[PDB]
Short mmCIF file of C-alpha atoms and ligand atoms in Angstrom, two decimals:
data_model
loop_
_atom_site.label_atom_id
_atom_site.label_comp_id
_atom_site.label_asym_id
_atom_site.label_seq_id
_atom_site.Cartn_x
_atom_site.Cartn_y
_atom_site.Cartn_z
CA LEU N 26 -22.22 30.60 186.27
CA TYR N 27 -23.70 30.51 182.72
CA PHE N 28 -22.44 26.99 181.96
CA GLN N 29 -23.15 24.01 184.21
CA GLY N 30 -21.30 21.29 182.21
CA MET N 31 -18.55 19.37 183.98
CA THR N 32 -16.80 15.98 184.08
CA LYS N 33 -18.61 13.59 186.50
CA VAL N 34 -16.63 10.94 188.43
CA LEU N 35 -18.18 8.11 190.31
CA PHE N 36 -16.07 6.78 193.19
CA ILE N 37 -17.69 3.35 193.63
CA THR N 38 -16.50 1.52 196.83
CA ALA N 39 -17.38 -2.00 197.83
CA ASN N 40 -15.58 -2.40 201.12
CA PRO N 41 -17.19 -2.56 204.57
CA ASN N 42 -14.11 -1.11 206.25
CA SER N 43 -12.88 2.48 206.15
CA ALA N 44 -9.68 3.72 204.71
CA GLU N 45 -7.81 3.26 208.00
CA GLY N 46 -8.74 -0.55 208.06
CA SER N 47 -8.68 -1.30 204.29
CA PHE N 48 -5.71 -1.22 201.89
CA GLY N 49 -8.03 -0.90 198.88
CA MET N 50 -9.99 2.09 200.37
CA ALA N 51 -6.65 3.69 201.38
CA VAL N 52 -5.32 3.65 197.78
CA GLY N 53 -8.74 4.68 196.51
CA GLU N 54 -8.89 7.84 198.64
CA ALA N 55 -5.39 8.76 197.57
CA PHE N 56 -6.22 8.52 193.82
CA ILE N 57 -9.39 10.65 194.44
CA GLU N 58 -7.63 13.46 196.17
CA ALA N 59 -4.84 13.42 193.58
CA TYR N 60 -7.43 13.60 190.82
CA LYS N 61 -9.20 16.51 192.59
CA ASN N 62 -6.06 18.56 192.92
CA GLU N 63 -5.34 17.97 189.22
CA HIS N 64 -9.00 18.31 188.05
CA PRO N 65 -10.92 21.13 189.78
CA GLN N 66 -14.52 21.83 188.57
CA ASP N 67 -14.94 18.14 187.96
CA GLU N 68 -17.43 16.49 190.32
CA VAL N 69 -16.79 13.38 192.28
CA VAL N 70 -19.71 11.43 193.73
CA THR N 71 -19.12 8.54 196.10
CA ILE N 72 -21.17 5.48 195.93
CA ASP N 73 -20.88 2.96 198.80
CA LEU N 74 -22.29 -0.29 197.42
CA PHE N 75 -22.80 -1.58 201.04
CA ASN N 76 -25.09 1.37 201.85
CA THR N 77 -26.86 1.59 198.46
CA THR N 78 -30.03 -0.19 197.35
CA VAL N 79 -28.87 -2.74 194.69
CA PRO N 80 -31.89 -5.03 193.89
CA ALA N 81 -30.88 -8.45 192.78
CA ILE N 82 -32.65 -9.81 189.70
CA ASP N 83 -35.41 -12.00 191.15
CA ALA N 84 -38.92 -13.09 190.26
CA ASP N 85 -40.23 -9.52 190.76
CA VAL N 86 -37.80 -8.12 188.29
CA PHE N 87 -38.50 -10.80 185.63
CA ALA N 88 -42.26 -10.11 186.20
CA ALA N 89 -41.68 -6.40 185.95
CA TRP N 90 -39.59 -6.77 182.74
CA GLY N 91 -42.37 -8.91 181.32
CA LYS N 92 -45.11 -6.31 181.76
CA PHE N 93 -42.84 -3.69 180.31
CA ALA N 94 -42.43 -5.83 177.24
CA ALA N 95 -46.15 -6.28 176.89
CA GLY N 96 -46.58 -2.52 176.47
CA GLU N 97 -47.73 -1.90 179.97
CA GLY N 98 -46.58 0.97 182.19
CA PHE N 99 -45.07 1.41 185.55
CA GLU N 100 -48.59 1.56 187.33
CA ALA N 101 -49.15 -2.03 186.36
CA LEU N 102 -46.44 -3.30 188.69
CA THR N 103 -46.92 -4.22 192.29
CA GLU N 104 -45.46 -2.01 195.01
CA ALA N 105 -42.60 -4.49 195.56
CA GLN N 106 -41.78 -4.58 191.82
CA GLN N 107 -41.99 -0.82 191.64
CA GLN N 108 -39.41 -0.14 194.43
CA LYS N 109 -37.01 -2.65 192.94
CA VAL N 110 -37.17 -1.25 189.33
CA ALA N 111 -36.94 2.28 190.57
CA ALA N 112 -33.77 1.43 192.51
CA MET N 113 -32.34 -0.30 189.52
CA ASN N 114 -33.14 2.80 187.37
CA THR N 115 -31.38 5.05 189.70
CA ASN N 116 -28.18 3.05 189.78
CA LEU N 117 -28.30 2.54 185.98
CA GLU N 118 -29.01 6.24 185.19
CA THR N 119 -26.38 7.62 187.57
CA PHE N 120 -23.72 5.33 185.98
CA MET N 121 -24.68 6.27 182.40
CA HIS N 122 -24.52 9.99 183.05
CA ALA N 123 -21.03 9.89 184.53
CA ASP N 124 -17.72 10.07 182.61
CA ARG N 125 -15.12 8.55 184.90
CA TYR N 126 -15.61 5.38 187.17
CA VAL N 127 -13.31 4.22 189.97
CA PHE N 128 -14.01 0.81 191.49
CA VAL N 129 -12.50 -0.32 194.81
CA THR N 130 -13.00 -4.01 195.64
CA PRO N 131 -11.41 -6.47 197.97
CA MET N 132 -10.78 -10.03 197.03
CA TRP N 133 -13.01 -12.51 199.02
CA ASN N 134 -12.49 -16.10 197.79
CA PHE N 135 -11.06 -15.32 194.40
CA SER N 136 -13.64 -12.64 193.50
CA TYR N 137 -15.46 -9.46 194.68
CA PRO N 138 -18.21 -9.04 197.25
CA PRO N 139 -21.55 -10.27 195.92
CA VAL N 140 -23.01 -6.70 195.84
CA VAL N 141 -20.63 -5.98 193.01
CA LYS N 142 -22.29 -8.64 190.90
CA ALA N 143 -25.69 -7.29 191.66
CA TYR N 144 -24.45 -3.80 190.73
CA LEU N 145 -23.17 -4.95 187.36
CA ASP N 146 -26.51 -6.74 186.86
CA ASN N 147 -28.18 -3.25 187.33
CA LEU N 148 -25.85 -1.65 184.65
CA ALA N 149 -26.11 -4.27 181.90
CA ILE N 150 -29.50 -3.49 180.43
CA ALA N 151 -30.45 -4.08 176.83
CA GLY N 152 -31.36 -0.83 175.05
CA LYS N 153 -29.59 1.31 177.63
CA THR N 154 -25.86 0.21 177.91
CA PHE N 155 -25.79 -2.32 174.93
CA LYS N 156 -27.73 -3.15 171.85
CA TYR N 157 -28.15 -6.13 169.60
CA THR N 158 -26.85 -5.79 166.00
CA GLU N 159 -26.28 -8.04 162.96
CA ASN N 160 -22.77 -8.71 164.37
CA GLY N 161 -23.57 -9.55 168.02
CA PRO N 162 -24.06 -7.08 170.88
CA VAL N 163 -22.41 -3.63 170.96
CA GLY N 164 -21.75 -1.42 174.05
CA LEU N 165 -23.46 1.88 174.05
CA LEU N 166 -21.48 3.87 176.54
CA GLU N 167 -19.08 6.15 174.86
CA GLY N 168 -16.21 8.47 175.96
CA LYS N 169 -15.89 6.65 179.39
CA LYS N 170 -12.76 5.58 181.38
CA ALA N 171 -12.70 3.19 184.27
CA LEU N 172 -10.24 2.39 187.03
CA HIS N 173 -10.27 -0.77 189.21
CA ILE N 174 -8.32 -0.86 192.47
CA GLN N 175 -8.36 -4.36 193.98
CA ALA N 176 -6.66 -5.31 197.15
CA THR N 177 -5.68 -8.96 197.60
CA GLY N 178 -3.89 -10.91 200.38
CA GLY N 179 -1.87 -13.01 197.81
CA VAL N 180 -0.42 -11.93 194.45
CA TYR N 181 -2.58 -12.30 191.34
CA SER N 182 -1.52 -9.49 188.95
CA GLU N 183 1.24 -11.44 187.23
CA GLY N 184 1.97 -15.02 186.61
CA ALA N 185 -0.38 -18.10 186.16
CA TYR N 186 -2.65 -17.02 189.09
CA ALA N 187 -4.06 -14.12 186.93
CA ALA N 188 -6.37 -16.81 185.59
CA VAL N 189 -8.10 -17.22 189.00
CA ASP N 190 -8.35 -13.41 189.45
CA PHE N 191 -12.09 -13.76 188.77
CA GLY N 192 -13.21 -10.51 190.40
CA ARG N 193 -10.83 -8.39 188.30
CA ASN N 194 -11.39 -10.23 185.01
CA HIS N 195 -15.19 -10.43 185.24
CA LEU N 196 -15.35 -6.63 186.03
CA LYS N 197 -13.30 -5.84 182.92
CA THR N 198 -15.42 -8.11 180.90
CA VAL N 199 -18.66 -6.43 181.80
CA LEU N 200 -17.24 -2.96 181.45
CA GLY N 201 -16.14 -3.67 177.90
CA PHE N 202 -19.54 -5.38 177.08
CA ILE N 203 -21.34 -2.08 177.89
CA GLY N 204 -18.72 0.05 175.95
CA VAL N 205 -16.17 0.84 178.66
CA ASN N 206 -13.16 -0.58 176.98
CA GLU N 207 -10.51 2.02 178.22
CA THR N 208 -9.69 0.56 181.62
CA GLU N 209 -6.99 0.90 184.23
CA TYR N 210 -5.95 -1.55 186.93
CA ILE N 211 -3.89 -0.97 190.11
CA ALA N 212 -3.16 -4.01 192.29
CA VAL N 213 -2.64 -3.70 196.07
CA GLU N 214 -1.32 -7.21 196.60
CA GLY N 215 0.81 -9.06 199.01
CA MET N 216 0.18 -7.27 202.41
CA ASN N 217 -0.85 -10.53 204.00
CA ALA N 218 1.38 -13.03 202.12
CA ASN N 219 4.30 -11.08 203.61
CA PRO N 220 2.97 -8.82 206.49
CA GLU N 221 6.44 -7.39 207.29
CA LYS N 222 6.48 -5.36 203.98
CA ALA N 223 2.69 -4.50 203.89
CA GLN N 224 3.22 -0.81 204.47
CA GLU N 225 5.76 -0.66 201.59
CA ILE N 226 3.19 -2.25 199.24
CA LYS N 227 0.56 0.11 200.41
CA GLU N 228 2.74 3.12 199.90
CA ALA N 229 3.96 1.98 196.58
CA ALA N 230 0.38 1.57 195.42
CA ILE N 231 -0.43 5.06 196.68
CA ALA N 232 2.41 6.51 194.54
CA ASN N 233 1.17 4.46 191.62
CA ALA N 234 -2.31 5.94 192.07
CA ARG N 235 -1.08 9.49 192.43
CA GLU N 236 0.76 9.26 189.03
CA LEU N 237 -2.21 7.85 187.23
CA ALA N 238 -4.44 10.66 188.46
CA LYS N 239 -2.59 13.31 186.49
CA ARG N 240 -3.17 11.48 183.11
CA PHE N 241 -6.47 9.60 183.87
CA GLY U 45 -19.35 -56.42 201.86
CA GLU U 46 -19.91 -53.71 204.31
CA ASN U 47 -19.87 -54.13 208.12
CA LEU U 48 -17.83 -51.00 208.74
CA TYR U 49 -19.76 -47.90 209.67
CA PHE U 50 -23.51 -48.96 209.55
CA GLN U 51 -25.44 -47.64 206.60
CA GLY U 52 -24.37 -44.07 206.56
CA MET U 53 -27.20 -42.30 204.71
CA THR U 54 -25.91 -40.23 201.74
CA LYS U 55 -27.11 -36.59 202.02
CA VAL U 56 -27.49 -34.73 198.75
CA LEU U 57 -27.83 -30.93 198.46
CA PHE U 58 -29.78 -29.58 195.48
CA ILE U 59 -28.82 -25.90 195.49
CA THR U 60 -30.77 -23.77 192.90
CA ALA U 61 -30.09 -20.22 192.00
CA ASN U 62 -32.69 -19.37 189.41
CA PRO U 63 -35.92 -17.44 190.35
CA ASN U 64 -37.83 -19.23 187.59
CA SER U 65 -39.08 -22.91 187.69
CA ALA U 66 -38.32 -25.78 185.35
CA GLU U 67 -40.81 -24.71 182.87
CA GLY U 68 -39.23 -21.29 182.31
CA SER U 69 -35.61 -22.28 182.88
CA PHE U 70 -33.39 -24.65 180.84
CA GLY U 71 -30.95 -25.17 183.78
CA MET U 72 -33.79 -25.98 186.16
CA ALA U 73 -35.47 -28.35 183.79
CA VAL U 74 -32.17 -30.21 183.46
CA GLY U 75 -31.48 -30.05 187.19
CA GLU U 76 -34.91 -31.40 188.11
CA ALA U 77 -34.37 -34.19 185.61
CA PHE U 78 -31.07 -35.04 187.21
CA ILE U 79 -32.67 -35.28 190.72
CA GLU U 80 -35.65 -37.44 189.56
CA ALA U 81 -33.07 -39.85 187.99
CA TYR U 82 -30.82 -39.81 191.01
CA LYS U 83 -33.76 -40.53 193.46
CA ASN U 84 -34.72 -43.52 191.33
CA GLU U 85 -31.28 -44.98 191.45
CA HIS U 86 -30.82 -44.33 195.23
CA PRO U 87 -34.30 -44.47 196.78
CA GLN U 88 -32.88 -44.17 200.35
CA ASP U 89 -30.59 -41.13 199.83
CA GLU U 90 -31.79 -37.89 201.25
CA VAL U 91 -32.25 -34.98 198.90
CA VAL U 92 -32.46 -31.48 200.55
CA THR U 93 -33.42 -28.63 198.28
CA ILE U 94 -31.86 -25.16 199.09
CA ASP U 95 -33.23 -22.24 196.91
CA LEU U 96 -30.86 -19.44 197.33
CA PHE U 97 -33.53 -16.89 196.27
CA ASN U 98 -35.62 -18.04 199.19
CA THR U 99 -32.95 -18.65 201.79
CA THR U 100 -31.23 -16.31 204.18
CA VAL U 101 -27.72 -15.75 202.86
CA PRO U 102 -26.01 -13.10 204.91
CA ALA U 103 -23.46 -10.97 203.02
CA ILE U 104 -20.02 -10.26 204.59
CA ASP U 105 -20.54 -6.65 205.76
CA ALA U 106 -19.66 -4.39 208.67
CA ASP U 107 -21.52 -6.46 211.29
CA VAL U 108 -19.67 -9.63 210.10
CA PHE U 109 -16.25 -8.08 210.40
CA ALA U 110 -17.16 -6.60 213.83
CA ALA U 111 -18.17 -10.12 214.82
CA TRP U 112 -15.03 -11.74 213.64
CA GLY U 113 -13.12 -9.03 215.53
CA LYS U 114 -14.65 -9.92 218.78
CA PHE U 115 -14.38 -13.66 218.10
CA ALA U 116 -10.66 -13.30 217.58
CA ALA U 117 -10.40 -11.14 220.66
CA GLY U 118 -11.48 -14.20 222.70
CA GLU U 119 -15.15 -13.37 223.40
CA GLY U 120 -17.94 -15.77 222.59
CA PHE U 121 -21.41 -15.54 221.13
CA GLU U 122 -22.63 -13.43 224.09
CA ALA U 123 -20.70 -10.33 222.97
CA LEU U 124 -22.19 -9.69 219.57
CA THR U 125 -25.15 -7.32 218.96
CA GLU U 126 -28.62 -8.58 218.06
CA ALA U 127 -27.80 -7.79 214.38
CA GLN U 128 -24.46 -9.60 214.59
CA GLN U 129 -25.93 -12.68 216.30
CA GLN U 130 -28.65 -13.22 213.62
CA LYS U 131 -26.11 -12.79 210.85
CA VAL U 132 -23.42 -15.11 212.34
CA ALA U 133 -25.99 -17.81 213.15
CA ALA U 134 -27.41 -17.88 209.67
CA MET U 135 -23.89 -18.18 208.25
CA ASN U 136 -23.27 -21.18 210.48
CA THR U 137 -26.47 -22.83 209.34
CA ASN U 138 -25.57 -22.59 205.70
CA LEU U 139 -22.02 -23.74 206.52
CA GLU U 140 -22.97 -26.77 208.57
CA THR U 141 -25.73 -27.73 206.22
CA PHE U 142 -23.21 -27.82 203.39
CA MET U 143 -20.48 -29.57 205.38
CA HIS U 144 -22.74 -32.33 206.72
CA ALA U 145 -23.67 -33.32 203.12
CA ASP U 146 -21.85 -35.68 200.86
CA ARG U 147 -23.11 -34.65 197.45
CA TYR U 148 -23.65 -31.17 195.93
CA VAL U 149 -25.64 -30.06 192.93
CA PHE U 150 -25.59 -26.46 191.62
CA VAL U 151 -27.94 -25.03 189.18
CA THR U 152 -27.25 -21.50 188.03
CA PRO U 153 -27.94 -19.40 184.87
CA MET U 154 -25.32 -17.12 183.17
CA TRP U 155 -26.21 -13.54 183.93
CA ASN U 156 -23.61 -11.28 182.32
CA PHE U 157 -20.84 -13.84 182.19
CA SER U 158 -21.27 -15.12 185.78
CA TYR U 159 -23.86 -16.36 188.27
CA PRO U 160 -26.52 -14.48 190.27
CA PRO U 161 -24.85 -12.58 193.13
CA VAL U 162 -26.48 -14.78 195.81
CA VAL U 163 -24.06 -17.54 194.63
CA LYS U 164 -21.03 -15.47 195.75
CA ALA U 165 -22.67 -14.68 199.04
CA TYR U 166 -23.36 -18.31 199.49
CA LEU U 167 -19.77 -19.29 198.66
CA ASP U 168 -18.52 -16.67 201.13
CA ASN U 169 -20.66 -18.41 203.69
CA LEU U 170 -18.80 -21.69 203.11
CA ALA U 171 -15.02 -20.84 202.77
CA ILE U 172 -14.44 -20.47 206.47
CA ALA U 173 -10.88 -20.94 208.02
CA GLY U 174 -10.71 -23.81 210.41
CA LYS U 175 -13.92 -25.32 209.09
CA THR U 176 -13.59 -26.03 205.29
CA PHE U 177 -10.00 -25.11 204.87
CA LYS U 178 -6.82 -24.29 206.77
CA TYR U 179 -3.28 -22.87 206.03
CA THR U 180 -0.13 -25.06 206.26
CA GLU U 181 3.51 -24.23 205.91
CA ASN U 182 3.23 -25.45 202.24
CA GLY U 183 -0.05 -23.44 201.40
CA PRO U 184 -3.72 -23.61 202.05
CA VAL U 185 -5.62 -26.95 201.75
CA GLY U 186 -9.18 -27.91 201.93
CA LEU U 187 -10.70 -29.94 204.67
CA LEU U 188 -13.93 -31.45 203.17
CA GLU U 189 -13.37 -35.15 202.25
CA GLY U 190 -15.46 -37.63 200.37
CA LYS U 191 -17.49 -34.96 198.54
CA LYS U 192 -18.69 -34.81 194.87
CA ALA U 193 -20.07 -31.73 193.19
CA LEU U 194 -21.97 -31.16 189.96
CA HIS U 195 -22.65 -27.80 188.40
CA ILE U 196 -25.31 -27.32 185.83
CA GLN U 197 -25.32 -24.03 184.01
CA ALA U 198 -27.59 -22.67 181.33
CA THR U 199 -26.04 -20.12 178.96
CA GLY U 200 -27.29 -18.32 175.91
CA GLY U 201 -24.12 -18.70 173.83
CA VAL U 202 -21.49 -21.40 173.91
CA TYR U 203 -18.65 -21.12 176.47
CA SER U 204 -17.37 -24.74 176.70
CA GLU U 205 -14.25 -24.61 174.55
CA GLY U 206 -12.02 -22.13 172.87
CA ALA U 207 -11.36 -18.64 174.19
CA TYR U 208 -14.94 -18.36 175.25
CA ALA U 209 -14.21 -20.63 178.32
CA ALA U 210 -12.05 -17.84 179.79
CA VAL U 211 -15.11 -15.59 180.19
CA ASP U 212 -17.29 -18.38 181.76
CA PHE U 213 -16.58 -16.79 185.11
CA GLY U 214 -19.57 -18.36 186.88
CA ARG U 215 -18.46 -22.00 186.11
CA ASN U 216 -14.71 -21.44 186.71
CA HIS U 217 -15.02 -19.51 189.96
CA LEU U 218 -17.41 -22.02 191.49
CA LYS U 219 -14.76 -24.72 190.64
CA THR U 220 -11.96 -22.77 192.30
CA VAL U 221 -13.80 -22.23 195.47
CA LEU U 222 -15.10 -25.81 195.62
CA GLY U 223 -11.56 -27.13 194.94
CA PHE U 224 -10.26 -24.80 197.70
CA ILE U 225 -12.40 -26.38 200.34
CA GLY U 226 -11.37 -29.97 199.36
CA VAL U 227 -13.85 -30.86 196.69
CA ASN U 228 -11.37 -31.35 193.88
CA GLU U 229 -13.81 -33.09 191.56
CA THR U 230 -16.75 -30.96 190.25
CA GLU U 231 -18.35 -32.42 187.08
CA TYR U 232 -20.14 -30.05 184.77
CA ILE U 233 -23.19 -30.13 182.50
CA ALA U 234 -23.62 -27.42 179.88
CA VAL U 235 -27.07 -26.32 178.57
CA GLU U 236 -25.60 -23.92 175.97
CA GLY U 237 -26.61 -22.45 172.62
CA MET U 238 -30.32 -21.84 172.98
CA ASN U 239 -30.11 -18.14 172.32
CA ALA U 240 -27.30 -18.47 169.73
CA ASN U 241 -29.45 -21.21 167.99
CA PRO U 242 -33.15 -20.73 168.65
CA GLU U 243 -34.10 -23.48 166.31
CA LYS U 244 -31.94 -25.89 168.35
CA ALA U 245 -33.41 -24.76 171.79
CA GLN U 246 -35.38 -28.02 172.30
CA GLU U 247 -32.75 -30.14 170.75
CA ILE U 248 -30.05 -28.75 173.06
CA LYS U 249 -32.37 -28.99 176.10
CA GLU U 250 -33.39 -32.50 175.28
CA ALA U 251 -29.74 -33.66 174.67
CA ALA U 252 -28.64 -32.13 178.03
CA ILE U 253 -31.61 -33.78 179.85
CA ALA U 254 -30.52 -37.17 178.56
CA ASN U 255 -27.01 -36.39 179.52
CA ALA U 256 -28.05 -35.57 183.11
CA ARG U 257 -29.98 -38.89 183.33
CA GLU U 258 -27.10 -40.90 182.21
CA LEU U 259 -24.75 -39.10 184.68
CA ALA U 260 -27.19 -39.76 187.57
CA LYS U 261 -26.50 -43.45 187.44
CA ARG U 262 -22.79 -43.06 188.40
CA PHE U 263 -22.83 -39.81 190.38
C1 LIG V 4 -13.59 -13.49 203.64
C2 LIG V 4 -12.24 -13.24 203.04
C3 LIG V 4 -11.80 -13.89 202.02
C4 LIG V 4 -10.53 -13.57 201.42
N1 LIG V 4 -10.09 -14.30 200.34
C5 LIG V 4 -8.86 -13.90 199.78
C6 LIG V 4 -8.42 -14.64 198.67
O1 LIG V 4 -9.13 -15.45 198.14
N2 LIG V 4 -7.22 -14.35 198.15
C7 LIG V 4 -6.38 -13.40 198.75
O2 LIG V 4 -5.21 -13.17 198.25
N3 LIG V 4 -6.76 -12.79 199.87
C8 LIG V 4 -7.99 -12.98 200.40
N4 LIG V 4 -8.49 -12.34 201.57
C9 LIG V 4 -7.63 -11.36 202.20
C10 LIG V 4 -7.79 -10.01 201.62
O3 LIG V 4 -7.64 -9.98 200.20
C11 LIG V 4 -6.93 -8.91 202.31
O4 LIG V 4 -7.48 -8.52 203.56
C12 LIG V 4 -6.86 -7.69 201.35
O5 LIG V 4 -5.92 -6.76 202.09
C13 LIG V 4 -8.16 -6.98 201.09
O6 LIG V 4 -8.55 -6.20 202.13
P1 LIG V 4 -8.93 -4.68 202.04
O7 LIG V 4 -9.52 -4.50 200.62
O8 LIG V 4 -10.01 -4.31 203.02
O9 LIG V 4 -7.73 -3.84 202.26
C14 LIG V 4 -9.70 -12.64 202.01
C15 LIG V 4 -10.14 -11.99 203.22
C16 LIG V 4 -11.43 -12.19 203.77
C17 LIG V 4 -11.89 -11.48 204.94
C1 LIG V 5 -29.90 -10.60 183.00
C2 LIG V 5 -29.48 -11.63 181.97
C3 LIG V 5 -28.17 -11.73 181.56
C4 LIG V 5 -27.68 -12.62 180.58
N1 LIG V 5 -26.38 -12.72 180.22
C5 LIG V 5 -25.89 -13.71 179.34
C6 LIG V 5 -24.70 -13.71 178.97
O1 LIG V 5 -23.78 -12.98 179.42
N2 LIG V 5 -24.28 -14.67 177.96
C7 LIG V 5 -25.13 -15.62 177.45
O2 LIG V 5 -24.69 -16.39 176.66
N3 LIG V 5 -26.38 -15.53 177.92
C8 LIG V 5 -26.82 -14.55 178.79
N4 LIG V 5 -28.10 -14.53 179.14
C9 LIG V 5 -29.11 -15.51 178.58
C10 LIG V 5 -29.29 -16.70 179.50
O3 LIG V 5 -27.93 -17.10 180.10
C11 LIG V 5 -29.90 -18.01 178.84
O4 LIG V 5 -31.20 -17.56 178.26
C12 LIG V 5 -30.06 -19.12 179.74
O5 LIG V 5 -30.71 -20.19 179.12
C13 LIG V 5 -30.94 -18.71 180.92
O6 LIG V 5 -30.90 -19.69 181.93
P1 LIG V 5 -32.24 -20.38 182.42
O7 LIG V 5 -33.11 -20.57 181.18
O8 LIG V 5 -31.92 -21.78 182.95
O9 LIG V 5 -32.99 -19.51 183.45
C14 LIG V 5 -28.57 -13.55 180.09
C15 LIG V 5 -29.95 -13.46 180.56
C16 LIG V 5 -30.37 -12.59 181.41
C17 LIG V 5 -31.80 -12.52 181.88
C1 LIG V 6 0.73 -16.83 204.17
N1 LIG V 6 1.08 -17.16 202.75
C2 LIG V 6 2.42 -17.34 202.34
C3 LIG V 6 0.07 -17.21 201.85
C4 LIG V 6 -1.09 -18.05 202.05
C5 LIG V 6 -2.04 -18.22 201.08
C6 LIG V 6 -2.00 -17.40 199.89
C7 LIG V 6 -3.05 -17.47 198.99
C8 LIG V 6 -4.42 -17.53 199.33
C9 LIG V 6 -5.39 -18.19 198.36
C10 LIG V 6 -6.71 -18.16 198.64
C11 LIG V 6 -7.19 -17.55 199.91
N2 LIG V 6 -8.52 -17.56 200.15
C12 LIG V 6 -9.44 -18.26 199.40
C13 LIG V 6 -8.99 -17.13 201.60
C14 LIG V 6 -6.26 -16.94 200.70
C15 LIG V 6 -4.99 -16.91 200.41
C16 LIG V 6 -2.63 -17.37 197.61
C17 LIG V 6 -2.89 -16.22 196.82
C18 LIG V 6 -2.47 -16.12 195.47
C19 LIG V 6 -1.77 -17.19 194.95
C20 LIG V 6 -1.41 -18.32 195.64
C21 LIG V 6 -1.83 -18.43 196.98
C22 LIG V 6 -0.92 -16.52 199.77
C23 LIG V 6 0.10 -16.37 200.67
#
């Protein structure tokens, strides 16, 4: 074809179990298939954070960032610093070039798996996703939309317990800091607080995901 | 005055989550000052340092779920694979090292409104059912008793009061998990405002260091 432009969607998952053993992954796959049937041509790339190199910010990264500030190039870094920065570049560039993001995270001790924090630490880079201005920082990503699907044993979406929903709230905060302010949230909650009605909660969340896909 | 349970040496855990040292980190410089002041008040208390950037902190992954599945089935430690045995043992080491301690000190910087990811993996190594918490008919309840925790955080801006405290996710999430495992009292020291006010960087650091020395006399 003469034109190669298309909407790029990133299906970012952070759950070790598959869709058959995870409520979050089950609703995540239902939203993706419903989005594909509504949006052909659009590309959907899956990113499993448990099988993706996500370097944590450590002494090598600070040392690598320091040499970059001193005007030095990539060759000045050690081999260990080179492999970490390159993997951080790939994660950042792939996220910046996409248009739609879909996060699937389970709640482990009031927050997400730790690899989600390292992944966000790979995305928040000054000069790339946000810039400093006279009136504080400003996110750089424009024309982006994000969906977060979180599965929790208890119920956190409504009530006072939304204050301890740290995984959901911190993800929304970082997304807005890099310019992704148009977000959507689908809660898959209560399958373990009341196991007798866990399948109804899953089925209701699937219907909630299939409706959002036609307008997302 | 005593004559109850012998001496009972107080174990203190100085848990750091910053790759830089005290010379290149405000939170570490305040954390090191608190320890030096605590050791002078209690010369016989044991202080064990745990650097999370140089400690095996296994993340909950596919091997951990497969291990917990075989443990719940009735099998023992002889059924796991070599990758599962190494991960489960290192989680028990971090768990029992934390449980056997009476005092806890955390030093973290704010990286994008939260802590480094290794802190979350370390907290997931501690919240274990039947060990640090259990579920009752009235709800979950922690099991650790007689513990006192202190969190030192260094942030560029100010997140102590107002609507900016709601986005201090690193401090708040650490308090919730510590309170979930029984440690209901976690004092907090803020080294904040160095990047918002670069001219007050040394004034804020020096004031927070003196605050940590005064707190070390009663902690
Ligand atoms: C290590 C661990 C920690 C958990 N912590 C919480 C929690 O803090 N609050 C909660 O409601 N459920 C908690 N759960 C239960 C999960 O939220 C529940 O399994 C949910 O369905 C997410 O699983 P899934 O995304 O794989 O479907 C925890 C489960 C595990 C294994
Ligand atoms: C990767 C990174 C992310 C940061 N994110 C924030 C932030 O979200 N809010 C803030 O006030 N400061 C932020 N800072 C600045 C540090 O929190 C601040 O300089 C703090 O003093 C660093 O802690 P330390 O000196 O003890 O290492 C960030 C710094 C880095 C390197
Ligand atoms: C069986 N039942 C009625 C329940 C037992 C426990 C829980 C909860 C919970 C909190 C923290 C957890 N963590 C940290 C593992 C796990 C569960 C819980 C979740 C949200 C609000 C209040 C409590 C909900 C229902």
